[PDB]
Amino acid sequence: VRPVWFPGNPPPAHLDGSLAGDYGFDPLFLGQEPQTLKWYVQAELVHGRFAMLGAAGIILTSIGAKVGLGFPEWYDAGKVVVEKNNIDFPTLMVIQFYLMGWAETKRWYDFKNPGSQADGSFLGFTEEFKGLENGYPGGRFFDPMGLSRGDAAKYQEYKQKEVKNGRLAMIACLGFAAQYAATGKGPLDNLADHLADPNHVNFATNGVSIPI
Amino acid sequence: LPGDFGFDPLGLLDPVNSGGFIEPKWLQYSEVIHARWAMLGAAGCIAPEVLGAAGLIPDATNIKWFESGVIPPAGSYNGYWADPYTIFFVEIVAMQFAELRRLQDFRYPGSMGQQYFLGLEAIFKGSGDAAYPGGPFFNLFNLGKTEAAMKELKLKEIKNGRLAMLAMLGYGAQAVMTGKGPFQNLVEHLADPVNNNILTNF
Amino acid sequence: RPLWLPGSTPPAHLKGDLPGDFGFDPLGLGANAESLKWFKESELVHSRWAMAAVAGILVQEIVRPDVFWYNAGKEVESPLGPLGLLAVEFFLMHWVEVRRWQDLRKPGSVDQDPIFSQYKLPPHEVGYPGGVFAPFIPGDLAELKVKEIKNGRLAMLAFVGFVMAAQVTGKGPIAALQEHLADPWGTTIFSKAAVVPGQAVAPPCKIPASVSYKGIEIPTPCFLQGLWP
Amino acid sequence: RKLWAPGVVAPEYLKGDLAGDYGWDPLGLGADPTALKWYRQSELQHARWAMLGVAGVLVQEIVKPDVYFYEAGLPQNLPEPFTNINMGGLLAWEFILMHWVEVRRWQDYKNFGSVNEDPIFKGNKVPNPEMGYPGGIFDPFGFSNLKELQTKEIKNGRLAMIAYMAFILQAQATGKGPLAALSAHLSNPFGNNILKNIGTCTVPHSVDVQGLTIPLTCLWPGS
Numbered sequence: 022v023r024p025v026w027f028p029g030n031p032p033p034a035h036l037d038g039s040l041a042g043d044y045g046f047d048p049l050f051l052g053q054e055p056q057t058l059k060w061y062v063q064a065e066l067v068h069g070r071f072a073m074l075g076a077a078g079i080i081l082t083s084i085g086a087k088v089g090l091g092f093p094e095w096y097d098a099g100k101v102v103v104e105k106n107n108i109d110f111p112t113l114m115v116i117q118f119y120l121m122g123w124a125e126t127k128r129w130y131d132f133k134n135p136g137s138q139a140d141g142s143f144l145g146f147t148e149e150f151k152g153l154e155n156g157y158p159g160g161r162f163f164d165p166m167g168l169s170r171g172d173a174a175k176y177q178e179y180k181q182k183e184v185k186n187g188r189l190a191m192i193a194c195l196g197f198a199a200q201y202a203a204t205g206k207g208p209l210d211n212l213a214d215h216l217a218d219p220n221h222v223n224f225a226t227n228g229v230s231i232p233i
Numbered sequence: 234l235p236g237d238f239g240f241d242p243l244g245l246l247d248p249v250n251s252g253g254f255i256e257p258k259w260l261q262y263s264e265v266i267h268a269r270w271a272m273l274g275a276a277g278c279i280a281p282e283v284l285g286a287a288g289l290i291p292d293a294t295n296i297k298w299f300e301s302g303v304i305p306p307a308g309s310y311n312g313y314w315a316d317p318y319t320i321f322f323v324e325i326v327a328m329q330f331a332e333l334r335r336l337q338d339f340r341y342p343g344s345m346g347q348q349y350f351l352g353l354e355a356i357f358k359g360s361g362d363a364a365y366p367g368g369p370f371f372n373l374f375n376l377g378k379t380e381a382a383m384k385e386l387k388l389k390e391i392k393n394g395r396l397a398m399l400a401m402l403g404y405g406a407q408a409v410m411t412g413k414g415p416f417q418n419l420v421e422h423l424a425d426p427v428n429n430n431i432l433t434n435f
Numbered sequence: 436r437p438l439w440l441p442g443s444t445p446p447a448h449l450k451g452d453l454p455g456d457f458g459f460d461p462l463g464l465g466a467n468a469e470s471l472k473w474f475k476e477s478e479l480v481h482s483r484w485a486m487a488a489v490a491g492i493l494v495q496e497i498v499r500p501d502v503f504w505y506n507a508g509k510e511v512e513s514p515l516g517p518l519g520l521l522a523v524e525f526f527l528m529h530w531v532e533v534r535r536w537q538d539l540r541k542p543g544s545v546d547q548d549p550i551f552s553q554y555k556l557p558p559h560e561v562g563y564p565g566g567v568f569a570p571f572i573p574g575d576l577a578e579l580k581v582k583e584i585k586n587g588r589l590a591m592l593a594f595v596g597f598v599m600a601a602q603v604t605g606k607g608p609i610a611a612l613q614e615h616l617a618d619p620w621g622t623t624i625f626s627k628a629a630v631v632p633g634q635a636v637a638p639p640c641k642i643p644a645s646v647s648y649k650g651i652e653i654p655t656p657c658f659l660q661g662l663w664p
Numbered sequence: 665r666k667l668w669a670p671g672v673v674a675p676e677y678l679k680g681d682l683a684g685d686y687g688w689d690p691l692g693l694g695a696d697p698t699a700l701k702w703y704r705q706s707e708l709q710h711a712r713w714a715m716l717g718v719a720g721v722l723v724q725e726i727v728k729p730d731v732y733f734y735e736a737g738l739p740q741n742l743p744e745p746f747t748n749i750n751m752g753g754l755l756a757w758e759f760i761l762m763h764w765v766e767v768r769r770w771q772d773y774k775n776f777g778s779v780n781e782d783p784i785f786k787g788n789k790v791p792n793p794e795m796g797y798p799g800g801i802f803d804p805f806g807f808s809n810l811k812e813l814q815t816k817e818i819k820n821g822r823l824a825m826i827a828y829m830a831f832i833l834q835a836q837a838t839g840k841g842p843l844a845a846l847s848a849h850l851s852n853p854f855g856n857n858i859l860k861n862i863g864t865c866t867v868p869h870s871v872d873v874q875g876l877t878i879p880l881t882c883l884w885p886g887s
């Protein structure tokens with residue numbers, strides 16, 4: 022009934038269609054256990070959301086680098102920010118570890134004990150750190166505009182859109198990494214080269230991706 | 234069943250204790266797949282030489298078939314719209330889609346007419362049979378509306394196919410040995426049938 | 436009931452209850468009621484500041500020319516110090532804003548004057564105070580609210596048009612309209628920039644650099660300057 | 665009742681309800697009826713714009729046989745009043761007015777019978793008896809029976825679609841207009857053939873317009 026990643030094969034028994042982006046794609050059966058599938062759903066959403074945020078950063082800084090604004094390219098951006106500002110590297114990395122470890126550990130122990138971060142132990146906050154579903158923490162802070170508690174079918178549509186855009190941005194970031202590792206250029210410079218010569222400037226002419 | 238002339242000296246269509254890819258359903262189906270690809274191969278390896286000898290296509294084209302870019306040691310052709318690897322990746326994606334949906338109809342009969350494929354689902358319902366799907370595109374004109382006419386057309390497809398398979402093995406053999414094209418071999422054997430044979434080119 | 440698209444259907448949470456309700460919510464940002472109260476208040480406040488802003492820019496360019504409204508904060512002069520003006524604005528706006536926000540979060544709890552206990556503001560709705568805020572009303576509120584939200588949406592669009600036209604042309608709104616009347620075919624946003632898959636061209640920014648005020652050196656960037664046509 | 669080929673059985677959803685129905689759908693694209701309605705509207709749009717384009721290229725080449733419609737789009741090749749015009753402002757006019765009329769017809773497709781009335785002047789209305797056939801001020805002479813005229817309309821339109829993509833194809837191959845190419849084939853039919861002129865695109869390779877360079881496109885790798 023529902024479209025499978027590979028038409029003709031039936032989907033596996035542990036992938037039913039209740040999840041967003043459920044195409045029955047598990048050929049290595051990594052999520053047969055429901056707890057492992059729950060944990061992988063939340064890991065997929067976290068990787069996807071970081072990839073969407075990262076890919077938007079790549080694209081906007083590369084637009085601002087091709088148009089003459091003086092923005093670095095993303096493989097030089099961290100070095101030029103640390104060196105042009107008054108920033109020491111390891112202190113900013115440790116402050117990142119502090120803030121991300123706090124938030125991340127709240128996420129970890131809300132996976133473990135599902136309603137437990139809404140006890141009020143963090144400063145006074147109650148039901149604003151309670152989750153709605155697995156990996157969907159919508160209260161007043163994380164869903165301030167409040168789309169998950171009105172028009173539930175439209176919210177299911179947004180869950181589908183979020184999972185699809187996240188998978189697309191994960192393969193796009195793997196893109197940017199591979200594109201840079203092959204060509205040694207900015208990715209929107211690579212896009213400009215492909216728009217210049219489509220038939221002749223590509224991965225079959227980089228001399229790396231197919232070494233024959 | 235099409236082309237059943239009883240010729241099986243090595244007994245490979247035995248239904249008793251079969252399996253794997255040696256099977257009547259796999260062997261007859263791969264027989265018609267090799268037959269159709271070899272008909273296209275025979276026509277495609279003839280056509281530039283005869284159309285350049287007839288004066289219809291120019292002399293920048295009409296090259297020998299092994300100098301097309303199949304074997305760049307044998308010679309390549311600059312004048313395509315891209316490099317042959319740029320061509321070959323499009324071939325990978327396109328033939329992957331085609332051959333892979335064909336494989337899925339072989340493994341699950343009729344399963345290629347449910348999941349959305351741009352409205353192209355009634356075209357790929359197939360039949361209760363591999364190797365002969367039909368439908369509004371694989372049978373454009375309703376040819377073989379009679380069952381006996383359908384058997385006759387399947388048998389003609391089998392015979393023209395086996396002839397083209399022998400012909401394509403011929404094109405490979407002649408191309409390796411005498412180093413020329415098959416229409417050039419026609420010209421030499423029709424010029425001197427005595428002094429231009431396999432026995433001369435050794 | 437007129438719509439943003441005549442013939443379509445409005446979303447199920449939009450009925451026609453609020454003024455200016457024409458069924459326009461494609462993202463579904465008002466399906467929560469508690470959110471929709473906050474966004475109605477924010478729409479009214481953005482609309483009123485934008486109407487007063489467009490009135491200020493128009494009357495400023497009419498009355499006092501050779502003063503560019505994007506640079507009035509630079510080229511203004513006063514014996515009133517900049518930090519003194521900013522401190523007065525800070526405390527007085529913090530006062531007024533917190534009074535209005537308390538009326539939002541607790542409906543009708545700051546009606547009474549704190550200094551003069553005689554004067555109390557009458558019961559009302561949120562966003563529409565009344566009383567001494569509205570001494571004179573022409574006609575009925577059922578149409579004036581619609582007029583207010585329509586003029587306010589049009590003036591919000593007008594203010595972002597003023598900002599973009601000032602950053603792209605470098606002139607005021609009346610001077611830019613005189614430019615578009617002097618060359619309508621040749622002075623449009625289509626006529627200044629285009630992106631083609633070959634090459635792309637953006638207009639030069641007419642706001643130069645970090646502005647040198649009295650030692651602060653205010654950085655002045657243009658809005659989304661890499662994404663203009 | 666005749667079909668597109670002898671011996672071919674028409675599909676079950678093709679019956680004779682729509683005009684120009686020869687039972688021809690080898691890809692099964694109209695198997696879903698909502699998609700069939702969308703492709704009927706797209707067929708009508710392509711047919712009417714192609715009839716307009718063929719009548720265009722025909723009359724333009726007849727009246728002014730020095731235009732060369734394939735290069736008529738340049739700013740220099742414009743008529744008497746505005747012949748160095750700003751193509752930005754021209755595209756601005758076209759974008760606004762076409763976006764208007766197009767969204768009106770799109771809402772006609774989405775809600776049939778909902779954009780018949782004039783929104784400004786409330787005493788005006790077009791009765792559309794079928795989708796894609798507005799009538800009223802769009803049918804000022806009013807010959808609408810309607811069915812045989814719809815068949816004539818879709819047959820002329822399919823012939824004009826084939827004829828206009830023919831026009832573009834010949835004009836890219838031999839570099840001339842349709843009447844000039846017909847005169848060349850009447851001059852010699854053996855020379856100046858499709859057997860000879862093909863393989864070379866006369867496409868002038870990224871014409872620089874006033875500020876920008878458009879990338880140019882031939883339908884086959886001729887060069």
Ligand code: CLA
Pocket residue numbers: 251252253254255
């Ligand atoms: C070396 C030991 C060995 C032996 C004794 C067998 C024996 C068998 N295999 Mg197994 N098999 C082997 C290795 C072996 N195989 C390997 C290495 C693979 C992985 C490729 C397989 C994968 C495999 C499959 C998928 C199948 C079999 C099947 C069979 C059975 C029938 C095959 C037959 O006669 O068809 C005749 C053989 C052919 C038609 C193919 C010959 C041509 C291919 C390309 C092999 C060429 C071999 C040659 C040495 C290569 C020269 C290269 C040089 C010119 C450059 C028979 C029991 C079939 C079966 O189970 O049916 C009951 C079956 O479907 N085998």
Ligand code: CLA
Pocket residue numbers: 439449453454455456457458459460463464465466471474475476477478481482588589591592595
């Ligand atoms: C200033 C911000 C602002 C806010 C908070 C609102 C809020 C509202 N609008 Mg209003 N609207 C605005 C500006 C705003 N509007 C402007 C400028 C126009 C003219 C284009 C309109 C035209 C309009 C119509 C026709 C209707 C509404 C309606 C509504 C209400 C329900 C829709 C909703 O839930 O979305 C909440 C909206 C927001 C949360 C603001 C969006 C914030 C996103 C993240 C920014 C995206 C904007 C994007 C950058 C474009 C900027 C402008 C662009 C031209 C450059 C809600 C009270 C409906 C109504 O009144 O029914 C009761 C209705 O029918 N609005």
Ligand SMILES: CC1=C[C@H](O)CC(C)(C)[C@H]1/C=C/C(C)=C/C=C/C(C)=C/C=C/C=C(C)/C=C/C=C(C)/C=C/C1=C(C)C[C@H](O)CC1(C)C
Pocket residue numbers: 046047048049050051052068069071072074075076078079094095096098099191192194195
């Ligand atoms: C499902 C399944 C199932 C079965 O069972 C098996 C198998 C098949 C194995 C599987 C599959 C898998 C896969 C495919 C995976 C992939 C992944 C990825 C790619 C990710 C990424 C992911 C990605 C990500 C996160 C990313 C992110 C990013 C980021 C943050 C960025 C950042 C940045 C920026 C902005 C800029 C600057 O200047 C720099 C940096 C710093 C650099």
Ligand SMILES: CC1=C[C@H](O)CC(C)(C)[C@H]1/C=C/C(C)=C/C=C/C(C)=C/C=C/C=C(C)/C=C/C=C(C)/C=C/C1=C(C)C[C@H](O)CC1(C)C
Pocket residue numbers: 240241242243244245266267268270271273274275276277278298299301303398399401402
């Ligand atoms: C019957 C029997 C029985 C018993 O039981 C046992 C035994 C004896 C074993 C058996 C036998 C068998 C046999 C004989 C077989 C043979 C086969 C063949 C020859 C094939 C080929 C086969 C072949 C084939 C497919 C082929 C194909 C081909 C092709 C596509 C080609 C293509 C092409 C062309 C166009 C042109 C250009 O230039 C390129 C190319 C690329 C070159």
